[PDB]
Amino acid sequence: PPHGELQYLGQIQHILRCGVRKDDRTGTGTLSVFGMQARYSLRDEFPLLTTKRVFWKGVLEELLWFIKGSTNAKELSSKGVKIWDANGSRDFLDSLGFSTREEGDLGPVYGFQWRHFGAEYRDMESDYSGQGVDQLQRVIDTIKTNPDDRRIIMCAWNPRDLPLMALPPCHALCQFYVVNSELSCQLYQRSGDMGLGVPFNIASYALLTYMIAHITGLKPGDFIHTLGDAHIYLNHIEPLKIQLQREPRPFPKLRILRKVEKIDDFKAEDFQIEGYNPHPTIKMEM
Amino acid sequence: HGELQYLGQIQHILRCGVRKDDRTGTGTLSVFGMQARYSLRDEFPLLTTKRVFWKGVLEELLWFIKGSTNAKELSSKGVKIWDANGSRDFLDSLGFSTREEGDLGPVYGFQWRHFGAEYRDMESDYSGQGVDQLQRVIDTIKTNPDDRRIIMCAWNPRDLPLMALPPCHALCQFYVVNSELSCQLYQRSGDMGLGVPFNIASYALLTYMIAHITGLKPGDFIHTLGDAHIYLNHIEPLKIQLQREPRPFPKLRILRKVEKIDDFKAEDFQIEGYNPHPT
Ligand SMILES: Cc1nc(=O)c2cc(CN(C)c3ccc(C(=O)N[C@@H](CCC(=O)O)C(=O)O)s3)ccc2[nH]1
Numbered sequence: 001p002p003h004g005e006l007q008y009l010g011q012i013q014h015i016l017r018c019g020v021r022k023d024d025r026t027g028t029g030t031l032s033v034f035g036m037q038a039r040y041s042l043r044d045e046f047p048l049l050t051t052k053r054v055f056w057k058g059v060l061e062e063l064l065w066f067i068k069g070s071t072n073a074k075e076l077s078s079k080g081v082k083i084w085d086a087n088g089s090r091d092f093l094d095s096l097g098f099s100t101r102e103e104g105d106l107g108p109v110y111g112f113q114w115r116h117f118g119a120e121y122r123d124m125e126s127d128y129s130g131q132g133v134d135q136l137q138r139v140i141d142t143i144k145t146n147p148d149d150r151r152i153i154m155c156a157w158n159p160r161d162l163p164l165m166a167l168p169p170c171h172a173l174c175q176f177y178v179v180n181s182e183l184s185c186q187l188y189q190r191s192g193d194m195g196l197g198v199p200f201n202i203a204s205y206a207l208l209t210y211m212i213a214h215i216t217g218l219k220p221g222d223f224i225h226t227l228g229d230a231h232i233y234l235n236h237i238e239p240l241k242i243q244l245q246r247e248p249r250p251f252p253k254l255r256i257l258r259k260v261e262k263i264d265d266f267k268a269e270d271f272q273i274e275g276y277n278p279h280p281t282i283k284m285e286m
Numbered sequence: 287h288g289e290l291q292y293l294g295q296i297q298h299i300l301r302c303g304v305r306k307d308d309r310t311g312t313g314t315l316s317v318f319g320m321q322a323r324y325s326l327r328d329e330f331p332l333l334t335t336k337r338v339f340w341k342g343v344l345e346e347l348l349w350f351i352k353g354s355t356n357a358k359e360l361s362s363k364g365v366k367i368w369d370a371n372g373s374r375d376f377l378d379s380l381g382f383s384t385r386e387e388g389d390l391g392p393v394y395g396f397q398w399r400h401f402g403a404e405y406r407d408m409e410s411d412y413s414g415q416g417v418d419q420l421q422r423v424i425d426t427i428k429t430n431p432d433d434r435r436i437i438m439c440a441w442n443p444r445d446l447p448l449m450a451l452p453p454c455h456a457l458c459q460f461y462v463v464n465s466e467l468s469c470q471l472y473q474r475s476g477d478m479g480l481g482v483p484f485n486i487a488s489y490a491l492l493t494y495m496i497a498h499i500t501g502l503k504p505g506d507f508i509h510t511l512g513d514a515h516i517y518l519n520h521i522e523p524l525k526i527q528l529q530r531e532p533r534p535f536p537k538l539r540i541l542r543k544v545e546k547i548d549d550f551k552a553e554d555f556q557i558e559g560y561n562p563h564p565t
């Protein structure tokens with residue numbers, strides 16, 4: 001049966017052959033296609049792309065940071081993961097008119113929404129215990145008590161809070177689904193940079209699904225990745241063409257090294273990637 | 287023929303689907319994660335292999351646009367599709383003893399126009415309260431079409447407990463390139479036999495409406511599904527439907543120049559050449 005990574009690579013080829021020129025904020029331009037979908041089996045494999053190295057450490061720490069409900073980019077940065085620092089910098093915050101906001105304060109993004117949806121956001125260091133809806137926990141409780149449910153959804157898109165965010169969410173929502181003891185996940189990603197973010201994003205939700213499957217006593221199933229604006233930035237075309245030349249190697253496995261009862265208890269040390277043999281990384285700027 | 291995609295999806299669920307129970311005890315064949323693409327360029331995707339309830343599509347959309355959450359209002363127009371969820375029994379079953387009959391809570395209309403406002407009842411005044419997502423979409427398409435955030439979201443976790451039915455159409459996104467407006471819908475759960483063809487037509491129509499307001503040509507409608515399923519008692523009738531060769535899609539004519547989305551009326555629309563098979 002074919003390698004799941006051929007779907008992602010298929011999507012790249014499709015955007016190069018059938019994409020349309022489309023401008024963006026940064027003046028760079030993109031080749032863009034609207035509406036794509038790919039399916040990655042999580043059964044005895046983990047979809048961490050091999051044709052280009054994916055920043056695993058960042059995937060893991062960013063997810064743990066989301067789970068804590070943090071929106072402090074400095075916290076994530078302290079762990080050697082710089083992926084949200086440009087958006088939290090004094091410069092970028094001032095350019096959105098957040099002059100009085102502290103450096104690193106990204107607003108009411110992922111962490112805040114997953115745990116405190118609809119609560120009144122003050123600042124990144126504030127107390128929010130019991131405020132808003134804890135979507136992550138509600139998902140977990142529903143999978144345990146009523147797996148056939150077709151409403152197991154986490155949503156980070158909050159129109160009321162948009163004006164306050166440093167970068168409005170790309171993963172607008174995700175849905176879970178359970179059949180024959182297999183947990184699957186679909187992600188609606190409104191906008192996807194195929195060169196940089198998308199492989200990282202695939203790994204984030206693949207990992208989330210492994211985490212929740214473990215908590216709930218289920219086997220990981222599929223991860224479905226659905227895209228809105230799927231695009232390649234023009235200065236990424238050359239490095240992506242190089243990537244298309246490479247034959248994928250087999251996916252690695254993800255081992256979880258102990259029994260964890262609650263999602264808040266997962267630590268980075270609990271996870272181990274086994275057999276990840278990626279080709280040498282190509283720089284893709286942003 | 288774009289309808290071959292929908293029919294393709296039916297066949298895929300029959301051949302590859304899995305037996306799965308649901309709220310109603312009926313059981314389903316189910317697949318998680320599907321996507322289909324329907325060209326809106328000089329055609330309108332109203333399915334021909336089984337008749338779609340056009341009048342209901344149109345009136346339901348106009349009702350969403352007004353911001354209405356009153357099932358009795360929709361019902362008054364001969365469209366009974368939300369009546370069971372607005373009935374007194376059902377309302378009491380969810381612990382809404384003091385809510386009036388027809389009041390579905392903060393559903394579609396409310397969210398599209400007043401997202402995050404404090405919902406009191408269906409007849410209340412909400413002028414200027416919350417976020418008007420529909421208008422913001424329209425204003426963004428006009429001023430900054432390249433934007434990748436043109437989104438309308440009906441999924442509001444804070445308001446879920448108050449709704450009679452949680453939304454199927456969690457969100458939709460718009461996209462503009464070369465003067466063509468496209469729409470993608472994330473539908474968490476889709477009954478391929480009944481709702482899905484109706485739902486395809488609703489968002490296809492929305493896209494035609496907004497394209498008209500913004501001066502753009504309709505492009506694609508992308509339909510993305512979470513739990514795509516057929517109920518077990520629909521298998522035999524759907525197999526009959528798969529036998530029928532689809533006929534070309536009809537056209538949608540808009541019969542006057544309308545400047546604002548709130549001004550569209552049912553009389554403004556005309557389906558031209560719709561030749562569906564007998565149900
Ligand atoms: C155009 C663009 N703008 C962004 O702000 C953006 C942000 C993210 C947020 N995010 C989730 C990530 C940002 C950066 C990642 C990353 O993998 N950084 C590695 C670089 C590895 C590489 O160059 O291939 C790193 O920190 O070194 S992952 C992802 C894609 C984006 N793409």
Ligand SMILES: Cc1nc(=O)c2cc(CN(C)c3ccc(C(=O)N[C@@H](CCC(=O)O)C(=O)O)s3)ccc2[nH]1
Nearest residue numbers: 310338339342367368477480481482484485517565
């Ligand atoms: C199993 C299921 N339960 C529901 O409650 C349900 C509700 C909707 C809400 N909705 C959006 C609609 C409800 C009814 C429609 C309809 O078009 N009825 C037609 C066709 C009748 C038929 O083919 O048997 C009609 O009454 O004329 S459209 C859609 C699918 C559902 N599917």
Ligand SMILES: O=c1ccn([C@H]2C[C@H](O)[C@@H](COP(=O)(O)O)O2)c(=O)[nH]1
Nearest residue numbers: 170191192193194197198201434435
């Ligand atoms: O996790 C993420 C975060 C951001 N992006 C991308 C997509 C776009 O290229 C850009 C987002 O900016 P807007 O779409 O909001 O303009 O960064 C991703 O692909 N994945």
Ligand SMILES: O=c1ccn([C@H]2C[C@H](O)[C@@H](COP(=O)(O)O)O2)c(=O)[nH]1
Nearest residue numbers: 150309454475476477478481482485
């Ligand atoms: O516009 C709609 C509304 C409802 N349904 C369906 C799918 C399910 O069969 C049922 C909803 O059940 P839940 O997923 O809410 O449990 O009605 C649709 O297909 N389209």
